[PDB]
Design a protein around this ligand. Structure first.
Ligand code: JD1
Ligand code: JD1
Ligand code: MG
Ligand code: MG
Ligand code: MG
Ligand code: MG
Ligand code: MG
Ligand code: MG
Lengths: 346, 346
């Protein structure tokens, strides 16, 4: 597994990231306390996941750049850009956990739930985002791809926030509206909210770093990676309810939060009129008893087995897309990522 | 007043901004509902202030670019960059109002206090930020200053968020700690949180658009503008308590929120031991009765008259800095801005 291999070097580079970001202090002691707080935010929220989005940048870069051009500086840049993707993710998750009223993340209390943090985490989240652009300037500003990366991170963040807006608008609190939860709407949500930044962004970053900037090259890659991202989000939705929290490191809130999840969309396609009412009376509410009722309806409709069939069909579909669209990139760039996300239970 | 003059054209350009941003829809109908929400967020939060930060870009640009190079496209770019500063401000204020538990802003309920918005405003705020970078790409990407502006907006946002972090760390909820509220700490807070983005950013943006990129040119400007920004924040703090809300369009929360405001710093320098206790028992708490007691202590110490003296001394100081550092820029670029902010009661 090419990810297990790169992973140690990647995670080891984290101190260097933290050191370089916490040395904006040297010229300005007056910001010392803010920098200390940034370090605490980095250590709590950027560490402890699987590093798969960041690691994808490094794996792809080694696979796309001739080994002779992989000098120490080039590699450092690669690990820094991977860390920029991790930082984006940390930004997103800190904010999303507030928005979704989540309890835990990566095996611990959500940052905003800590006594003394609360909605100060909005600022913390946005500091994480800032760090991306400081790292890109500090490590890449003289490279011919610098602007390309900046634009890519900014565009990916815009798209992601557009997705997040569709997510919140499709899920109004205190209102039951099942009629909105369609397959078509679901696919749009997840494409925007998850698939651009989790799949297109890291591979595209590595492409640009390898000098692969062609519009066609990027569009072909994107066809593969947006579909892989739809599957990843569907798996995330399944794991919200049916995943084991000691594996996933987080507690599910989709049913309470009235979310357009793949599960509710699937349920709706299959429910009888009686069951539609059951869903209607119980969905989108805080009461544990009502959440359990929704889960029992999902289990009655064999939605786990529906998920397992879908995962198998999606995996084939994605592999067909790799066959169509990988060239002239090595298929391994996509295959290692597919392997990483399929059968994933965390 | 050169601002009153430019203001109408500036504000008129707002529809065009909204139209160009709400036409990301044409190629992608699936994002239509998100775009509609973006429009509502823009119309609620970017309109209704004084436009002084955005307008500074336009005024300075007309003052720094030879009239012969001020073609229709150049002007459109100038008004768009001004609008980018307004959008940054709107991002900041939407988030800050959540963080500070504010009630009103620009003469209406804060966006997050609207039923149905709540903490979804975190996403709304960040969409406003995204729009900056889309506008810079859509209007300026072929200009030789494009990267300079991008970096300037990103750096200004980082600095601003560093300031905001010092603001929250100096103001812990449920803890009384007056010992932290020193002049030295106050000056650092406000330099970072307010002075970079409210004063340096717009003038610097116009400088770059005029081809003025020299390091020295920017550092001289910055000496003037960071000091003007310290004064503006001190005035903001004074107006938090002593301003008329129908003029300021917002209700003050500094005392409730345990803030390192200029007022509390001034109070502390002047309080007797008895009065220190009064402040200690009453500051940083939600009770109206305790807030009134703090205000009565401030009035007993003649802190309004202290503010009026300070405004006079600061105005002279700033004018001395314009005399030292304006050249070779026209002094009018700084003078119109000073005029705009001194004696300001809103
Ligand atoms: C400005 C900030 C709010 O923008 C964001 C935009 C998107 C996201 C985001 C995108 N994809 C997935 C997540 N989290 C997942 P999760 O299961 O919480 O990890 P989701 O809530 O189920 O969608 C968050 C987080 C933040
Ligand atoms: C990511 C986001 C939270 O970052 C921010 C960073 C800074 C600010 C900010 C900077 N200067 C002034 C304000 N608002 C003023 P206000 O009187 O609320 O308009 P302050 O709360 O008294 O400081 C907000 C707002 C948002
Ligand atoms: Mg979530
Ligand atoms: Mg969410
Ligand atoms: Mg989820
Ligand atoms: Mg405030
Ligand atoms: Mg504030
Ligand atoms: Mg204030």
């Amino acid at each position: 597994d090419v990810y297990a291999q790169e992973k140690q070097d990647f995670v080891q580079h984290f101190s260097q990231i933290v050191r370089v970001l916490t040395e904006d202090e040297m010229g300005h002691p007056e910001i010392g306390d803010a920098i200390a707080r940034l370090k605490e935010v980095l250590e709590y929220n950027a560490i402890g996941g699987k590093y798969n989005r960041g690691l994808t940048v490094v794996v792809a870069f080694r696979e796309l750049v001739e080994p002779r051009k992989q000098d120490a500086d080039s590699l450092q840049r690669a690990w820094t850009v991977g860390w920029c993707v991790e930082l984006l993710q940390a930004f997103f998750l800190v904010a999303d956990d507030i928005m979704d009223s989540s309890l835990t993340r990566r095996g611990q209390i959500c940052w905003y739930q800590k006594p003394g943090v609360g909605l100060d985490a909005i600022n913390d989240a946005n500091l994480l985002e800032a760090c991306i652009y400081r790292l890109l300037k500090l490590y890449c500003r003289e490279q011919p791809y610098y602007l390309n990366l900046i634009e890519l991170f900014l565009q990916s963040s815009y798209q992601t926030e557009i997705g997040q807006t569709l997510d919140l608008l499709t899920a109004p609190q205190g209102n039951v509206d099942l009629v909105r939860f369609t397959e078509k709407r679901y696919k749009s949500i997840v494409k925007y909210k998850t698939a651009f930044y989790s799949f297109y962004l890291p591979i595209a970053a590595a492409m640009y770093m390898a000098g692969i900037d062609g519009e066609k090259e990027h569009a072909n890659a994107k066809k593969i990676l947006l579909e892989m991202g739809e599957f990843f989000q569907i798996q995330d939705d399944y794991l919200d309810l049916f995943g084991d929290p000691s594996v996933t490191g987080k507690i599910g809130t989709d049913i309470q939060d009235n979310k357009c999840s793949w599960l509710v969309v699937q349920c709706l396609q299959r429910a009888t009129p009686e069951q539609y009412q059951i869903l209607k009376e119980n969905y989108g509410q805080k009461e544990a008893e009502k959440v359990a009722r929704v889960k029992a309806l999902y289990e009655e409709l064999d939605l786990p087995a529906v998920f397992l069939q879908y995962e198998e069909d999606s995996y084939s579909h994605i592999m067909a897309l790799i066959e169509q669209y990988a060239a002239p990139l090595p298929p391994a760039v996509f295959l290692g990522l597919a392997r990483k996300i399929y059968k994933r239970r965390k």
